[PDB]
Design a binder for this molecule. Structure first.
Ligand SMILES: Nc1ncnc2c1ncn2[C@@H]1O[C@H](COP(=O)(O)OP(=O)(O)NP(=O)(O)O)[C@@H](O)[C@H]1O
Ligand SMILES: Nc1ncnc2c1ncn2[C@@H]1O[C@H](COP(=O)(O)OP(=O)(O)NP(=O)(O)O)[C@@H](O)[C@H]1O
Ligand SMILES: [Mg+2]
Ligand SMILES: [Mg+2]
Ligand SMILES: [Zn+2]
Ligand SMILES: [Zn+2]
Lengths: 665, 421, 101, 52, 656
DNA sequence: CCCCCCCCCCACCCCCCCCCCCCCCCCCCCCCC
DNA sequence: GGGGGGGGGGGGGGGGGGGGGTTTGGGGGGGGGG
């Protein structure tokens, strides 16, 4: 009964007044029994919300604003006490309330997941609870330039001073909880707007997906604020010296922080590869091309002015359209007739992990401030230059064990970590000769390959498509690195036989299945496939034998369905698709498999005036391909007019006519 | 609760049948005598109901809108028992209340008086035409022709929302031949002028009466009303309601004033007596006072064999110097004359003099409303400072003063009104 | 005093001596103004208010204005053989309200 | 402390290149920043528009 | 540790607000219970400097009046438990519900079973420090308590409105629990909570209770609105005890809540989601004449001075030098006579009407402007600024009801007061003729648009006028000095003739007085505020035998409490005076002596006795009244005869 | 030239629409050839 | 190893229910008569 909930909220409100407040004689001042009150609040979290799976206390604590109005004041004032004392050297007690404040922050910032195992109460309360965590993240990053962050590192430093052995289990746990605090503060992110599907949709959809609370803007939550507050509290320095000092109880949270820093930021944004106004002028010219295009597709006179075109077909029958531009351009008339159809084919549809490169829209970017850009790129630079190989060895040498018990989230975050920093160092080393590929040498050490192979193989066998996609990305970066070191050169030949047979088959099977999965899944399949083919060509077991495993129709469907997003794709992605087509069609000469109308449609749309950029390099590749493709299609139809029907359909898997269809004698 | 209503009804029946003072059963006598002259009502003094059994008065005054119909029903049953030999048809009798509860002045009535029996007083400033309200509706379903009925008590019903055993959504209709109706009239009561607060505009109430209380008052009469202060949700604020009174009683020749006026007629000094009695504080002006007596009495109105009709009304103009007591004489004549209206020439407009168009807020439809001449019909219109009146107003006086009519064509309403003034 | 196009009921509508409140009012051809209007500004010149009672709306609006009046003498041409009394069509109620000529 | 709301910000441009007349209103300039001139005939009651 | 139904907080915890909005904090039940205890302690323990509890005494008085309203002074709450004053300012709708419950608790403690007399108490928040003009209100004031100045421009009727209302669902088991009605919108029932579905709904006729309701259009004061702008307005809503506390055409000061609501009409016509707004009034104050028991005793004390009449008359318009006959007439008018009615048959005017006729620059307008500040009910109108209807009464077709209603003119607004008509000579005669009825018969008899009625207009009219052509000309009699006719002139039953004669010893004293008065009025000329008030008091005593602040309360007291009688007056003295005045008034150009002038002597003698707070009129009052009227007549003459008339009438006046 | 007049201006059925329910189609998964 | 058949989800159509759709007074401007 809700009587219990209002009683609980009354209790937490009374506890909220017990913690402390401002003293007018303004400074924050602790309450009587304040340590016992903090312990009792920790006990409320345990006693009710954990033990009964409710999150009611986690809601009530936010209602009475304890985190923002008591705990961060306590920690920041305690930080100032200890800072001033350090310069000028009953802290034995106040240390305890600082620690219990940190425990409460770790609890209240603890990441939220919703599953079939969650209670009905939890999944009901999930949204507003996420919103309150976002207010917490804003306050933690903003308040006194986030001085509580230095409070957290100081609490950790006061057990890093003592010996490696002298750090007791309590000290080890305390350092781990400090890492979980920083991880959580990175990890809070706006929740998904999750809708009941029993009742039908109205005549309009959801009015907005925005789930922020009114006192928050997205910039308050953005990475930029994280970088600024972490720099101004030297959290980056703390993490860098911590990973340098590793010489392993805390290694998994320490990896996890770097994952949460990397999961959604693109490496190219840290490299350039009147400047802002100049580039804005470039952007505006580019969209002005689309303006002149739609203007060509627009009437010179008012909408009520419309006369009627009639398209008499090649047969003695007539259609009718009102388009004034179409009246003098039959292309527009035909396509407008097709646009007018009310009918569509109905299309069928298609969680405990955060948003990332695994599931973001493919053009998403963090727009850094240049100070934060410098601070972040130099932080991850110094990490790579110190902490990478040691950390990766520590955690991968963990993950050699306990693979059967590795939780799905842990698997995907490990794979993303691997991929992200390997990709970054490859890119930086392409940009700087001063940067060295050997600085990520741990990636190529054979245990790492074996584990990544075990992860991808088990994920695919389990049909865990999330982790399969993660391992697919990690494999792409492993192969990418392999190609770079094959040029920069032994271990290359080791992995180039260890990946034989069933691994070749597995890699050949992802782009068969990819057509059934999201754009990013398909993109990673294409990326992996391009890397695989360039690797095998660089080596060249037999080259014809392997590529035959790729040149099959579901792979062509996956490439087509990827290419169907052509406007939203990037020039390099289209280049990779058309290099694959160059191989299949020009080099391998299995041209019959691409004589199908879906490709014809897609080629026309992208070569259209409202298709690709006229100046695009990828448009040049498409044009080159299309010229050769049309010439061969004309030639095959001239030799075989049955293909005028066959163009409509999948090719005949009946070999006895299929060979004749494929080659025409 | 029908047993409880039956015991209320039987309690009232016992009150009619048993109440007696000084050896006379006053309400049995009054009910029988009312039946003989074929007015089906009973006038009850609530002092007597209190004196009989104050529990009944407490029930009545706690919720009159439920208790009054039961009292009416009890009166019908006793009426039959005292005027028809049963085992060898009358309508629903109207209850009429007399009271001496302390009056609430018309301005002080507010939300705490809603549905209480209230006693007040004022001037009736308008009296609408009669209107027909249903008492018994004979009701038919449009599809299946299932017939039923509504018996109505007019103290505050609607047609039933759907058929009382597809039959359509909103199906019922009234059978106007078998349904029974009663007369209803609307009155507007203005507060007594000498009770208006300083600098206030005089406030007024709309109020309703039915059966034998219709046509019982005319505009300008000063009355005391007994009624239920009550509410209705008009079409024209938010969560607001229009107040009104449902009248339950009105108080506004006798066989000995007949004798008094015979004796006064027989007095030889009568004309001097009446002359002295006009404006007694005004010294002198003897012939003018004599003429005012003549104007008050009037001549004799006549009709000829041709249907032609001749003025009985006298018109008098007092033209003269300042401070000669002219206005004082007019403001006296407005007191003594049984029907009178006082206006001043500069206060007038032709509309407010003859008659005007109105749109009734209750029906929300047009009706014509009488001006000063009509309200003075049967008496004197005292037009003070007449020399200040505009020319068009003095034109409008002509028909009402000499033809003693007002001819109308306004809002499409063609009409002619009488002005014996 | 006018009807409001929004509310429909009456309202005050500001004349020039209100726009010139805490300011100056300049009148050309003042002697050729109707006496109907010369007797209207008498309050504003001295009591520095406009008092109104019309259409059931009552007001006393501020008219703290310095008035500057361009006047012609009677018949247009001045004659110093006459008094300033005789040179003007004005009379003592309005001439006394002016400070200096 | 009591919650202080987020502050709204108005970006008031001024000193534009030219003033267009009311008669120069032409619908391609919909959504464009302009400067305009005329004489004010009436001004409304100040009311709260529901912003968010 | 403690029962959750009784957990309660410290005052510093209340200062330590830790819900998000203030209202979210007030509605937290521990905070609510604490606030209840806090306000109860405030009412029972805040005191006067005498140590007497303020709200103990105000509650005692509340019960004696059987009132529903308790006037809590906000400044008291700001002095003690100031956090509650902050919550009351920032969040009045929640706070006032709590404070109402607390106030009912306090008075139920003081009077057992006051729940039988009223089921509720409303606190009225008096003396709220910050004030806004109607132009000055904004979005940031929404839901805030405000204190506003304006004039009540249009007041509707006293309608009932729903307060607590159970509703009936016409499906299922019908009843729904009681909704509380606001001032802004109709109740909505999205679904019936029993059947959890849509349906028809209807008011439950047994369990519903009503309160009084009245909208008022409140508008900017004309002495406040800046130039070049339309005056702004808001719909005030009055509830319960506040209805008809004011009447149109009067200034008010309004403590209330500035609340908005959705309205599809405003959105429709404006094309933006723009909300309507009101001021839900919490208290209304009119904006001096009220007095205390010590002030009553002071009036008695000073009145028995045998010189009080002349000290009053000198106090009239004290910075106006000389003009003692004007000040006498103004004193007589402002105290008035006694209205009468013989047996109900013959009502007699009590008011005294005064005309100031004279030259330019002789303070006539300033005398009227003095009386405008000095009288309890008064209004001021000038010349072509008036109209006949704007002066007596008018009618309008109400935009709400579409019925015709009266609206009072100046002589209705000044009922039981005095009406001030400047430039009486330069009104149109089609406006002047409207004065006649109200000025003598004390009434206005409208017959317009179906309305036919007589209003009370008990006014003394004081009028100021210039003679014909521009100034007075004593070669002529009155009937040629002025355009006004005998009827209207006979109603002005004292005439003052004012002349600007050059006279050196009078002009030097006058000019010295005017210059002294100018510097004594210059702007630059027990704390600092009180100290300059004490200097101001001595400056007032430089010219005024009694304070104006005292005189106004003395006037209002004398008017409302004192009713003189002509016990044993000298009949033959008055009768011979009237007979001789009538005989000498046979001169066809002279002031028309009439029976109403005889009544004027009697009214004036009553007014002088009223100045003495006297139950009985003395010979001295009647002699002074005769002398005033005789002087008024004698000076209304061409100078060729004035000396002879003065000599003849001297036998009546020079006995005193 | 001044004042008064008078003229103007203003305050029950049928359609659209929405909600609810049932069926049919299309995809996925498993078995059979 | 591919194609058919069974089972479940999702979308579209069709039906049913409901709500909406001129007089009177006042002020000011403008023109005509004494
Ligand atoms: N003969 C009289 N006897 C007694 N009182 C009189 C007499 N004549 C006049 N009065 C008084 O004088 C006043 C007369 O007022 P009123 O009735 O208006 O006179 P009037 O004839 O109407 N003059 P006017 O209104 O200017 O046309 C009242 O106050 C009377 O009491
Ligand atoms: N006796 C006086 N004492 C003081 N001030 C005076 C006196 N006589 C005239 N004044 C001044 O004269 C000025 C004008 O006064 P005012 O009230 O307009 O006189 P008035 O007689 O009404 N002139 P008018 O409006 O043409 O009839 C004011 O500012 C007064 O201060
Ligand atoms: Mg008269
Ligand atoms: Mg003056
Ligand atoms: Zn039926
Ligand atoms: Zn229901």
């Amino acid at each position: 009964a809700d009587f219990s909930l209002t009683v609980l909220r009354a209790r937490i409100a009374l506890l909220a007044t017990a913690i402390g407040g401002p003293d007018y004689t303004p400074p924050y001042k602790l309450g009587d029994d304040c340590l016992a009150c903090l312990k009792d609040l920790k006990r409320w979290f345990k006693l009710v919300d954990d033990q009964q799976k409710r999150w009611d206390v986690a809601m009530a604590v936010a209602e009475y604003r304890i985190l923002t109005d008591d705990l961060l004041p306590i920690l920041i004032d305690w930080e100032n006490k200890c800072s001033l004392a350090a310069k000028l050297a009953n802290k034995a007690y106040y240390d305890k309330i600082a620690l219990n404040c940190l425990q409460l922050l770790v609890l209240m910032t603890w990441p939220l997941i919703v599953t079939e195992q969650s209670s009905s109460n939890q999944i009901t309360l999930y949204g507003e609870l996420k919103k309150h965590q976002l207010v917490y993240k804003k306050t933690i990053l903003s308040m006194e330039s986030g001085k509580v962050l230095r409070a957290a590192i100081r609490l950790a430093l006061d057990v890093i001073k003592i010996d490696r052995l002298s750090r007791t289990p309590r000290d080890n746990m305390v350092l781990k909880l400090v890492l979980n605090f920083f991880r959580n503060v990175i990890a809070i992110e706006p929740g998904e707007f999750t809708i009941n599907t029993k009742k039908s949709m109205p005549k309009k959809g959801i009015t907005s997906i925005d789930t922020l609370p009114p006192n928050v803007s997205m910039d308050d939550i953005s990475l930029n604020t994280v970088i600024s507050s972490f720099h101004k509290n030297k959290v980056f320095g703390f993490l860098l010296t911590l990973t340098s000092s590793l010489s392993d109880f805390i290694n998994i949270p320490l990896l996890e922080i770097m994952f949460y820093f990397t999961k959604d930021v693109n490496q190219e944004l840290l490299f350039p590869r009147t400047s802002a106004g100049f580039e804005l002028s470039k952007l505006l010219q580019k969209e002005h091309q689309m303006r002149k295009n739609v203007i060509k597709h627009t009437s010179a006179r008012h909408s009520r002015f419309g006369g009627l075109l009639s398209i008499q077909t090649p047969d003695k029958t007539r259609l009718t359209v009102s388009g004034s531009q179409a009246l003098v351009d039959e292309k527009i008339a035909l396509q407008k007739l097709d646009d007018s159809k009310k009918w569509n084919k109905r299309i069928i549809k298609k969680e405990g992990l955060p948003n990332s490169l695994l599931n973001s829209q493919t053009g998403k970017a963090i727009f850094f401030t240049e100070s934060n850009g410098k601070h972040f790129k130099e932080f991850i630079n110094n990490f790579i230059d110190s902490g990478f190989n040691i950390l990766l060895h520590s955690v991968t040498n963990y993950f050699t064990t306990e693979q059967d018990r590795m939780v799905t989230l842990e698997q995907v975050e490990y794979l993303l970590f691997f991929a992200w920093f390997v990709k970054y160092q490859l890119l930086r080393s392409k940009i700087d000769n001063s940067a060295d590929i050997k600085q990520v040498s741990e990636a190529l050490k054979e245990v790492t390959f074996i584990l990544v192979s075990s992860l991808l193989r088990s994920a695919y066998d389990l049909k865990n498509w999330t982790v399969t996609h993660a391992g697919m990305i990690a494999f792409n970066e492993l192969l990418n690195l392999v190609s770079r070191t094959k040029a920069a050169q032994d271990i290359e030949f080791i992995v180039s036989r260890l990946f034989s047979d069933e691994r070749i088959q597995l890699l050949s099977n992802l782009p068969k299945i990819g057509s059934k999965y999201s754009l990013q899944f398909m993109k990673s399949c294409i990326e992996l496939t391009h890397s695989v083919l360039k690797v095998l060509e660089q080596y060249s077991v037999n080259f014809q034998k392997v590529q035959a495993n790729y040149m099959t129709e579901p792979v062509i469907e996956t490439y087509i369905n990827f290419l169907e997003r052509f406007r939203e794709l990037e020039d390099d992605s289209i280049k990779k698709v058309f290099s694959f087509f160059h191989r299949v069609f020009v080099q391998a000469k299995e041209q019959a498999l691409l004589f199908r109308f879906d490709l014809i449609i897609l080629l026309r749309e992208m070569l259209s005036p409202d298709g690709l950029d006229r100046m695009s390099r990828s448009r040049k590749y498409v044009s080159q391909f299309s010229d050769y493709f049309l010439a061969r299609l004309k030639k095959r139809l001239k030799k075989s007019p049955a293909w005028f029907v066959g163009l409509l359909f999948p090719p005949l898997h009946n070999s006895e006519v299929g060979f004749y269809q494929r080659y025409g004698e | 609760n029908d047993d409880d209503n039956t015991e209320i009804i039987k309690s009232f029946k016992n009150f009619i049948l048993e109440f007696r003072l000084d050896s006379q059963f006053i309400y049995r006598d009054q009910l029988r005598n009312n039946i003989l002259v074929k007015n089906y009502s009973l006038t009850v003094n609530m002092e007597h109901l209190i004196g009989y059994n104050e529990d009944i008065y407490k029930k009545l005054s706690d919720e009159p809108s439920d208790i009054i119909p039961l009292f009416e029903t009890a009166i019908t049953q006793v009426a039959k028992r005292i005027s028809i030999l049963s085992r060898a048809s009358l309508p629903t009798f109207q209850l009429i209340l007399n009271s001496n509860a302390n009056q609430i002045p018309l301005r002080d009535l507010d939300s705490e008086h809603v549905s209480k029996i209230v006693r007040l007083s004022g001037i009736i400033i308008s009296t609408s035409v009669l209107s027909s309200r249903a008492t018994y509706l004979s009701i038919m379903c449009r599809n299946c022709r299932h017939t039923t009925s509504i018996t109505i008590n007019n103290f505050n019903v609607s047609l039933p929302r759907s058929c009382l055993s597809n039959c359509g959504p909103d199906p019922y209709i009234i059978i106007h031949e078998s349904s029974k109706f009663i007369d209803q009239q609307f009155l507007k009561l203005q507060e007594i002028p000498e009770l208006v607060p300083v600098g206030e505009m005089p406030r007024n109430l709309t109020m309703t009466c039915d059966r034998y209380l219709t046509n019982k008052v005319i505009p300008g009469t000063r009355v005391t009303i007994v009624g239920i202060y009550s509410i209705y949700n008009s079409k024209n604020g938010v969560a607001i309601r229009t107040p009104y009174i449902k009248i339950l009683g009105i108080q506004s020749f006798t066989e000995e004033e007949e004798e008094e006026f015979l004796q006064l007629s027989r007095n030889p000094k009568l004309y001097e007596i009446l002359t002295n009695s006009i404006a007694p504080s005004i010294f002198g002006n003897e012939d003018i006072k004599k003429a005012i007596v003549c104007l008050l009495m009037g001549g004799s109105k006549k009709i000829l064999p041709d249907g032609m009709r001749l003025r009985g009304d006298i018109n008098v103009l007092l033209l003269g110097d300042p401070g000669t007591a002219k206005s004082q004489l007019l403001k006296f004549v407005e007191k003594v004359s049984p029907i009178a209206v006082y206006t001043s020439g500069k206060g007038s407009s032709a509309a407010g003099l003859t008659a005007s168009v109105q749109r009734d807020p209750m029906t929300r439809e047009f009706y014509l409303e009488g001006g000063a001449m009509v309200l003075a019909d049967g008496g004197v219109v005292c037009i003070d400072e007449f020399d200040k009146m505009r020319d068009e107003d003095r034109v409008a006086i002509h028909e009402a003063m000499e033809q003693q009519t007002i001819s109308i064509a306004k809002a499409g309403i063609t009409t002619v009104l009488n002005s014996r003034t | 005093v006018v009807r409001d196009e929004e509310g429909g009921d009456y309202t005050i509508e500001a004349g020039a001596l209100m726009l010139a409140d805490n300011g100056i009012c300049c009148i050309d051809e003042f002697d050729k103004m109707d006496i109907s209007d010369q007797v209207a500004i008498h309050e504003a010149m001295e009591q520095q208010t406009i008092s109104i009672a019309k259409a059931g709306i009552h007001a006393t609006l501020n008219a703290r204005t310095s008035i500057l009046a361009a006047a012609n003498p009677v018949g247009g041409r001045y004659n110093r053989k006459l008094s300033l009394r005789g040179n003007l069509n004005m009379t003592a109620p309005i001439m006394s309200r002016f400070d200096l000529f | 402390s009591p919650e202080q709301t987020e502050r709204v910000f108005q970006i008031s441009f001024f000193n534009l290149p030219t003033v267009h007349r009311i008669r120069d209103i032409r619908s391609e300039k919909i959504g464009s920043l302009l400067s305009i001139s005329g004489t004010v005939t009436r001004t409304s009651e100040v009311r709260p528009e529901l912003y968010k | 540790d403690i029962d959750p139904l009784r957990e309660e907080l410290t005052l510093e915890s209340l200062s330590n607000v830790k819900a998000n909005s203030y209202s979210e904090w007030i509605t937290q039940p521990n905070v609510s219970r604490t606030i209840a205890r806090e306000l109860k302690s405030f009412l029972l323990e805040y005191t006067d400097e005498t140590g007497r509890s303020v709200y103990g005494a105000r509650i005692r008085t509340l019960g004696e009046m059987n009132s529903e309203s308790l006037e809590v002074n906000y400044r008291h709450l700001a002095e003690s438990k100031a956090i509650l004053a902050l919550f009351l300012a920032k969040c009045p709708e929640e706070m006032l519900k709590i404070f109402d419950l607390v106030a009912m608790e306090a008075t139920e403690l003081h009077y057992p079973d006051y729940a039988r007399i009223h089921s509720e108490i409303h606190v009225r928040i008096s003396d709220f420090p910050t004030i806004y003009s109607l132009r000055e209100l904004r979005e940031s004031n929404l839901s805030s308590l405000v204190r506003v100045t304006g004039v009540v421009t249009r007041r509707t009727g006293v309608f009932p409105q729903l307060k607590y209302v159970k509703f009936n669902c016409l499906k299922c088991g019908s009843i729904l629990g009681p909704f509380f009605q606001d001032s802004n919108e109709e109740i909505r029932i999205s679904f019936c909570t029993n059947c959890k579905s849509k349906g028809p709904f209807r008011v439950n006729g047994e369990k519903t209770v009503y309160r009084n309701y009245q909208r008022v259009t409140l508008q900017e004061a004309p002495g406040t609105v800046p130039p070049g702008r339309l005056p702004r307005h808001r719909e005030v809503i009055l509830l319960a005890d506040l209805v008809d506390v004011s009447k149109p055409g009067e200034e008010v000061e309004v403590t209330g809540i500035y609340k908005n609501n959705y309205d599809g009409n405003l959105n429709a016509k404006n094309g933006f989601p723009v909300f309507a707004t009101i001021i839900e009034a919490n208290s209304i104050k009119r904006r001096v004449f009220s007095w205390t028991e010590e002030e009553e005793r002071e009036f008695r004390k000073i009145s028995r001075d045998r010189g009080i009449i002349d000290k009053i008359i000198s106090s009239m318009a004290p910075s106006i030098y000389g003009h003692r006959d004007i000040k006498t007439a103004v004193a007589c008018s402002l105290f008035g006579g006694v209205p009468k009615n013989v047996n109900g048959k013959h009502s007699i005017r009590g008011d005294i009407n005064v005309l100031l006729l004279g030259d330019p620059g002789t303070a006539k307008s300033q005398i009227l402007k003095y009386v405008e500040k000095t009288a309890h009910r008064a209004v001021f109108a000038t010349g072509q600024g008036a109209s006949a209807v704007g002066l007596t009464a008018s009618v309008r077709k109400d935009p709400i009801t579409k019925e015709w209603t009266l609206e009072g003119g100046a002589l209705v607004l000044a009922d039981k007061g005095v009406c001030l008509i400047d430039e009486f000579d330069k009104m149109n005669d089609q406006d002047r003729t409207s004065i006649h009825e109200a000025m003598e018969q004390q009434s206005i008899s409208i017959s317009k648009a179906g309305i036919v009625t007589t209003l009370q207009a008990r006014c003394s009219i004081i009028a100021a006028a210039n003679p014909n052509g521009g100034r007075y000309n004593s070669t002529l009699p009155l009937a040629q000095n002025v355009s006004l006719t005998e009827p209207i002139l006979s109603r002005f039953d004292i005439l003052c003739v004012v002349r600007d004669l050059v006279d050196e010893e009078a002009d030097e004293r006058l000019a010295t007085f005017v210059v002294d008065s100018h510097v004594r009025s210059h702007p630059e000329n027990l704390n600092a505020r009180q100290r300059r008030l004490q200097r101001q008091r001595k400056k007032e005593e430089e010219i005024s035998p009694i304070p104006q602040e005292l005189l106004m309360k003395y006037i209002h007291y004398a008017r409302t409490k004192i009713y003189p009688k002509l016990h044993q007056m000298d009949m033959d003295k008055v009768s011979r005076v009237y007979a001789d005045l009538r005989r000498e008034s046979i001169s066809t150009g002279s002031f028309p002596i009439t029976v109403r002038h005889l009544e004027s002597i009697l009214r004036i003698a009553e007014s002088f006795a009223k100045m003495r707070l006297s139950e009985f009129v003395s010979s001295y009052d009647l002699d002074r009244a005769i002398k005033v009227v005789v002087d008024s007549f004698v000076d209304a003459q061409k100078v060729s005869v004035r000396r002879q008339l003065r000599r003849s009438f001297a036998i009546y006046t020079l006995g005193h």
